[PDB]
Amino acid sequence: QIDGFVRTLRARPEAGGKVPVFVFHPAGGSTVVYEPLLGRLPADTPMYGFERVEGSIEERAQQYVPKLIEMQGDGPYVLVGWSLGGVLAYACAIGLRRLGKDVRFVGLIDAVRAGEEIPQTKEEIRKRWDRYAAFAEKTFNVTIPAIPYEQLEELDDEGQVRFVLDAVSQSGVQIPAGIIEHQRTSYLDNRAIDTAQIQPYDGHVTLYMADRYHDDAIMFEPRYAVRQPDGGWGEYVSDLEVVPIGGEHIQAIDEPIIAKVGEHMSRALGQIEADRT
Amino acid sequence: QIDGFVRTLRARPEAGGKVPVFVFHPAGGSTVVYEPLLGRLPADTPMYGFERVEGSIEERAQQYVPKLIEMQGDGPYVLVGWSLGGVLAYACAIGLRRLGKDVRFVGLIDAVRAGEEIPQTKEEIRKRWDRYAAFAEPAIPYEQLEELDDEGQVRFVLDAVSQSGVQIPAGIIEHQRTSYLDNRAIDTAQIQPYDGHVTLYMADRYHDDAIMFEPRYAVRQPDGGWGEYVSDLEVVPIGGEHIQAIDEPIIAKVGEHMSRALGQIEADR
Numbered sequence: 001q002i003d004g005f006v007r008t009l010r011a012r013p014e015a016g017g018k019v020p021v022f023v024f025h026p027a028g029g030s031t032v033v034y035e036p037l038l039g040r041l042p043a044d045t046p047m048y049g050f051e052r053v054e055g056s057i058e059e060r061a062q063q064y065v066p067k068l069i070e071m072q073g074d075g076p077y078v079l080v081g082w083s084l085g086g087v088l089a090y091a092c093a094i095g096l097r098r099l100g101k102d103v104r105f106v107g108l109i110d111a112v113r114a115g116e117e118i119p120q121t122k123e124e125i126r127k128r129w130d131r132y133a134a135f136a137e138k139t140f141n142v143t144i145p146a147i148p149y150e151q152l153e154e155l156d157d158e159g160q161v162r163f164v165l166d167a168v169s170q171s172g173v174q175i176p177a178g179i180i181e182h183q184r185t186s187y188l189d190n191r192a193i194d195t196a197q198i199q200p201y202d203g204h205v206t207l208y209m210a211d212r213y214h215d216d217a218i219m220f221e222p223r224y225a226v227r228q229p230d231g232g233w234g235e236y237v238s239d240l241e242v243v244p245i246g247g248e249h250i251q252a253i254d255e256p257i258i259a260k261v262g263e264h265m266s267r268a269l270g271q272i273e274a275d276r277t
Numbered sequence: 278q279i280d281g282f283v284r285t286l287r288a289r290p291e292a293g294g295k296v297p298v299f300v301f302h303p304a305g306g307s308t309v310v311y312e313p314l315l316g317r318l319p320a321d322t323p324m325y326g327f328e329r330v331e332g333s334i335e336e337r338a339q340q341y342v343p344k345l346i347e348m349q350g351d352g353p354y355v356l357v358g359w360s361l362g363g364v365l366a367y368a369c370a371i372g373l374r375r376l377g378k379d380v381r382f383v384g385l386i387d388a389v390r391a392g393e394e395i396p397q398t399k400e401e402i403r404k405r406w407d408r409y410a411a412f413a414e415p416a417i418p419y420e421q422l423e424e425l426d427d428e429g430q431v432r433f434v435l436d437a438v439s440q441s442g443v444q445i446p447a448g449i450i451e452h453q454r455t456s457y458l459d460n461r462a463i464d465t466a467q468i469q470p471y472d473g474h475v476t477l478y479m480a481d482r483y484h485d486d487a488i489m490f491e492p493r494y495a496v497r498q499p500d501g502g503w504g505e506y507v508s509d510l511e512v513v514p515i516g517g518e519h520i521q522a523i524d525e526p527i528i529a530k531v532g533e534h535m536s537r538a539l540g541q542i543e544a545d546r
């Protein structure tokens with residue numbers, strides 16, 4: 001069932017059968033979160049989940065794309081993801097199209113840009129860690145000293161957290177390694193998105209659009225408090241369809257909202273299958 | 278040419294031909310505003326426009342629906358509108374469905390609800406007319422204004438400003454009076470659920486004149502306010518501002534998509 005970074009959610013038949021749906025993991029979760037979507041798709045639809053790898057968004061796609069091709073050849077490709085998953089799905093669509101492959105569906109489940117770009121500057125790193133430290137004071141009922149900004153501001157997101165965690169440890173707080181790994185992994189995967197180099201795409205994209213980001217996403221990054229009607233995709237995708245679903249980003253992957261996603265995606269898959277004839 | 282409130286933009290051939298597109302006027306405009314859209318729609322598509330009549334939004338569609346049925350009989354109905362005209366088109370779709378008619382396309386060109394409800398209270402009436410005075414770059418007695426409906430408000434304020442010594446040509450005053458009231462009528466529209474496919478062509482934002490008119494137009498939701506009324510809702514982002522959605526080059530993005538929709542309907546006959 002787990003082979004490297006590919007999880008089999010529903011195996012395709014030994015030969016022929018329906019076009020598989022490739023789903024991509026969200027930050028801090030695995031592709032098991034697509035089980036409710038799978039239940040709202042047509043019977044016998046195969047589904048494979050791509051789990052986390054390292055690198056920039058671009059680098060991650062360079063690892064996925066050869067694997068996609070080993071599995072599915074020239075196409076057709078159906079690529080779906082919620083949250084960071086949607087960004088990874090799109091980046092895969094881009095890589096596959098560069099190689100001449102047939103991409104027929106790109107389904108983005110509330111994968112919505114920050115309402116303003118996230119500056120990649122020393123000043124923003126300072127302001128971000130001052131916010132985080134303020135929340136940590138309240139929560140851990142503790143006084144945080146002067147931040148060693150000169151050191152943090154030269155590191156990448158991984159290095160910044162590694163520095164903060166080494167400081168927390170020789171502060172005298174010992175965190176269970178599984179909580180560290182989970183928190184660190186989630187944080188860095190969500191930060192990867194901020195510097196995704198989005199390329200134009202020539203095919204059809206379907207954006208399932210919730211009303212707003214949830215509170216934990218806004219705590220993470222305050223610029224998620226505002227969103228545009230096109231989720232930031234309009235300049236890159238001329239053939240863009242938006243399917244409003246309401247609710248919050250965190251709800252979009254679960255029952256009951258996922259039924260709306262599934263009903264729509266089911267018709268799109270049905271159209272792809274009939275076309276294949 | 279024109280017959281009552283019905284404008285012929287392109288008459289359908291006397292037998293056969295394509296399904297007509299029915300368009301509805303925006304505030305302060307005529308249905309001639311749809312000619313650029315028509316240019317981007319399939320060749321020989323008939324088009325008829327419904328021009329201004331009196332009433333609440335619902336009363337207007339009470340006049341339009343008998344007329345629609347007069348022209349097209351059973352269906353298929355294709356209803357399109359920009360701005361106020363989207364709201365009118367939608368109100369017509371609701372009336373036609375009550376009469377059992379076949380509505381196959383409802384095209385809303387950036388017909389987007391204000392980000393919050395416009396309160397129907399005396400303090401809002403006061404706030405509103407204060408904001409309009411300040412766009413002077415007179416004085417207004419509130420006790421009287423705040424008891425009047427929209428029609429009486431606008432006539433009362435116009436009377437105070439000519440009494441002040443300002444001279445605006447009567448034809449301009451009248452055109453601005455009905456533009457104002459037609460947009461204001463949308464605020465109390467009683468939106469009903471619709472059981473078919475709606476396509477909402479979605480701009481990035483309202484233009485500045487719209488926000489000056491009603492500041493709540495500064496904020497919009499991803500569904501344009503329609504999600505609670507329409508379960509089969511498709512949003513087609515088009516970018517730009519409201520006022521540009523009806524013109525070249527943005528109307529080409531509308532027309533390219535609409536043209537695929539209408540071709541699907543022609544085949545299915």
Ligand SMILES: COc1ccc(CCNC(=O)c2nc(-c3ccc(OC)c(OC)c3)no2)cc1OC
Nearest residue numbers: 083084111112113193194196198216217220232233
């Ligand atoms: C602590 O919990 C969280 C914290 C933050 C998030 C949101 C992360 N952001 C996204 O999912 C997301 N960005 C985009 C997106 C979409 C389009 C873009 O360019 C056009 C783009 O340019 C960088 C980004 N598409 O999706 C989710 C969380 O919990 C699940």
Ligand SMILES: COc1ccc(CCNC(=O)c2nc(-c3ccc(OC)c(OC)c3)no2)cc1OC
Nearest residue numbers: 360361388389390460463466468486487490502503
């Ligand atoms: C001075 O120039 C202007 C001033 C104001 C406007 C905007 C008027 N508003 C609209 O076009 C409009 N409201 C809606 C809408 C849509 C959905 C609704 O509920 C579901 C709703 O419930 C009240 C309203 N759909 O469209 C346009 C202007 O110039 C063109």
